[PDB]
Write an enzyme that holds these catalytic residues in place. Structure first.
Site, PDB file in Angstrom:
ATOM      1  N   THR A  65     -48.825  97.593  19.434  1.00  0.00           N
ATOM      2  CA  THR A  65     -50.263  97.729  19.189  1.00  0.00           C
ATOM      3  C   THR A  65     -50.638  97.697  17.708  1.00  0.00           C
ATOM      4  O   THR A  65     -51.827  97.728  17.366  1.00  0.00           O
ATOM      5  CB  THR A  65     -50.799  99.060  19.765  1.00  0.00           C
ATOM      6  OG1 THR A  65     -50.041 100.162  19.234  1.00  0.00           O
ATOM      7  CG2 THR A  65     -50.712  99.054  21.287  1.00  0.00           C
ATOM      8  N   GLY A  66     -49.636  97.626  16.839  1.00  0.00           N
ATOM      9  CA  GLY A  66     -49.901  97.630  15.413  1.00  0.00           C
ATOM     10  C   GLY A  66     -50.443  99.002  15.089  1.00  0.00           C
ATOM     11  O   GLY A  66     -50.072  99.972  15.735  1.00  0.00           O
ATOM     12  N   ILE A  67     -51.325  99.096  14.105  1.00  0.00           N
ATOM     13  CA  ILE A  67     -51.905 100.383  13.758  1.00  0.00           C
ATOM     14  C   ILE A  67     -53.217 100.509  14.525  1.00  0.00           C
ATOM     15  O   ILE A  67     -54.289 100.138  14.035  1.00  0.00           O
ATOM     16  CB  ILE A  67     -52.129 100.522  12.231  1.00  0.00           C
ATOM     17  CG1 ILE A  67     -50.797 100.340  11.493  1.00  0.00           C
ATOM     18  CG2 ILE A  67     -52.719 101.892  11.902  1.00  0.00           C
ATOM     19  CD1 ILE A  67     -50.919 100.360   9.985  1.00  0.00           C
ATOM     20  N   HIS A  68     -53.097 100.947  15.772  1.00  0.00           N
ATOM     21  CA  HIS A  68     -54.232 101.147  16.670  1.00  0.00           C
ATOM     22  C   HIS A  68     -53.834 102.234  17.646  1.00  0.00           C
ATOM     23  O   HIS A  68     -52.693 102.710  17.623  1.00  0.00           O
ATOM     24  CB  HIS A  68     -54.532  99.874  17.476  1.00  0.00           C
ATOM     25  CG  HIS A  68     -55.072  98.749  16.655  1.00  0.00           C
ATOM     26  ND1 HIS A  68     -54.286  97.711  16.205  1.00  0.00           N
ATOM     27  CD2 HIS A  68     -56.316  98.513  16.169  1.00  0.00           C
ATOM     28  CE1 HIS A  68     -55.016  96.887  15.476  1.00  0.00           C
ATOM     29  NE2 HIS A  68     -56.250  97.354  15.439  1.00  0.00           N
ATOM     30  N   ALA A  69     -54.782 102.635  18.488  1.00  0.00           N
ATOM     31  CA  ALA A  69     -54.551 103.641  19.523  1.00  0.00           C
ATOM     32  C   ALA A  69     -54.050 105.001  19.019  1.00  0.00           C
ATOM     33  O   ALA A  69     -54.504 105.492  17.974  1.00  0.00           O
ATOM     34  CB  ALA A  69     -53.610 103.071  20.608  1.00  0.00           C
TER      35      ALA A  69
END
Length: 87
Positions: free
Chosen positions: A12-16
């Site tokens: 999600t990369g830098i998310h959630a």
């Protein structure tokens, strides 16, 4: 001032959740903490700014910590990145 370049490996990369957790960690410190991606720098203590940066898997980012407790802040940032599977 301390600076470190990381390579994001999370799906999600830098998310959630990982992003929210990173932001919360940054917020515990007095130092100024910035996140830079593709020549754009945001305040790592701000959730809206981080979420809007659009950092996905494979991204190269730089985190800068500047202040009295910068050493403590950098150490915590690195730990958080590792435990949330971000870098």
């Amino acid at each position: 001032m301390e600076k470190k370049e990381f390579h994001i490996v999370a799906e999600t990369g830098i998310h959630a959740r990982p992003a929210t957790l990173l932001v919360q960690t940054a917020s515990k410190f007095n130092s100024d903490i910035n996140l830079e991606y593709k020549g754009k720098s945001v305040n790592l203590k701000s959730i809206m700014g981080v979420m809007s940066l659009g950092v996905g898997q494979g991204s190269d980012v730089t985190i800068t910590v500047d202040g009295a407790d910068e050493a403590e802040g950098m150490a915590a940032i690195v730990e958080t990145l590792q435990k949330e599977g971000l870098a």
